[PDB]
């Protein structure tokens, strides 16, 4: 029942020049987003990724906008280390110990996401997820990163396997991750394919299956939420809180 | 938390509206009904009221003329029909048509039609409304007494108690005060226990939702869905909505998520 901070998804490439992604990043802030999750990915490339970030990064910092960057490459990550973005989203969970001490000299909060790319007993995935967090958080702490800087993401959708039951189990049991490590947790359900396998609808185009899962996560204590339609979630969270 | 029926709103007057001519497209309303049903609607809430207040005998026979083809066609396909009208002459036409529900936003205040309502097998949607700056607490108390007096006067005439569905009213029907709508939304389970009757919640696209967020809720679904979700988990028996598919798809997520 805690107020969740919204993460606005802005993809730099599919929106673009830089201005179409910039104006998409301020319209979401004008809609109730606390942090803008910047993504700039194409096909097949470190300089190409960074070149699209620099104009959007410092433009949002010129207006005091908290920025999250979705990158799994350490060279792109070390760039975000010294640009001093407020968040750095890694869908791989920092598996390369090269930049470990590099992440300790910084202060940007780290987001530790877990995935399991093939046979899914849905609870066995949860247990190994508990052990994955226990080993990766410790090694990050041993490298100098403060424990108060890690945010856990249990993964969702195709990051948990083609089985929709796996994503349902984690959506019901993510409070257990909250109290086992005493740390914040973000849930990302927006337009993920497994929502269509439950309702039989055209995902990526239907907001309501998506909205129902984000309110459920908010009502169970999710600290952060990652979505596309921000003004829809912002109004869903305003109604949900005022309604008791 | 449990079951919930969905009322599909079909404004026959709106589906036959004015793009440069009025109330001759009697098939758009019929297609809007059959559409909403394959989106997950349980009952079709037909509404053929005039665009502006009309209280003559012509507006009566005009309301039946807009309901007569839509009611008939939906009957041939086994569709639960609910008529959204507050006129006694229109309601008597719905009784002889064997319509499933009669949705009255005035709470049936005319005793002349009580005789016709007793013989009917249709269910009744008794709605409560407000006088016209009343404190939200006193609106709830007067609503309780209003249901208590009107339910008795209906069973006195011969309407079996179990056919009465209670609607507390929402938004402008409770006043321009948003907290009055919030109080009813978070305290309506007290209605189902005091009267042991079903309760219908109708929040779809009401102005008070915009006063809480600050967005145009008349054409948007997110605040309508958030409020419709809360009433579902709180045990609302029926749900009157516009976007049936978005609510039906939403109910399929909460049922899987538990
Ligand atoms: N933290 C987090 N980030 C993501 N980035 C991209 C995508 C692709 O949908 N998913 C996610 C996600 O599920 N969680
Ligand atoms: N049963 C019921 N019917 C309504 N009809 C029209 C309108 C106006 O939107 N409201 C309602 C309502 O709140 N409850």
Author numbering:
A (entry chain C): -1 to 14, 23 to 50, 57 to 129, 137 to 263
B (entry chain A): -1 to 130, 138 to 263
Paper text:
The sulfonamides (sulfas) are the oldest class of antibacterial drugs and inhibit the bacterial dihydropteroate synthase (DHPS, encoded by folP), through chemical mimicry of its co-substrate p-aminobenzoic acid (pABA). Resistance to sulfa drugs is mediated either by mutations in folP or acquisition of sul genes, which code for sulfa-insensitive, divergent DHPS enzymes. DHPS catalyzes the condensation of para-aminobenzoic acid (pABA) and 6-hydroxymethyl-7,8-dihydropterin pyrophosphate (DHPP), producing 7,8-dihydropteroic acid (7,8-DHP); this compound is further transformed, ultimately leading to tetrahydrofolate, an essential precursor for DNA and RNA synthesis. All three Sul enzymes adopted the (ɑ/β)8 TIM barrel fold also shared by DHPS.
We determined the crystal structure of Sul1 in a ligand-bound state, and the Sul2 and Sul3 enzymes in both apo and ligand-bound forms to resolutions between 1.74 to 2.8 Å. Comparison of Sul apo and ligand-bound structures revealed conformational changes in these three loops triggered by ligand binding. We noticed that the Phe residue that is conserved across Sul enzymes (Phe178 in Sul1, Phe179 in Sul2 and Phe177 in Sul3) and localized to the active site adopted different rotamer conformations depending on ligand binding.
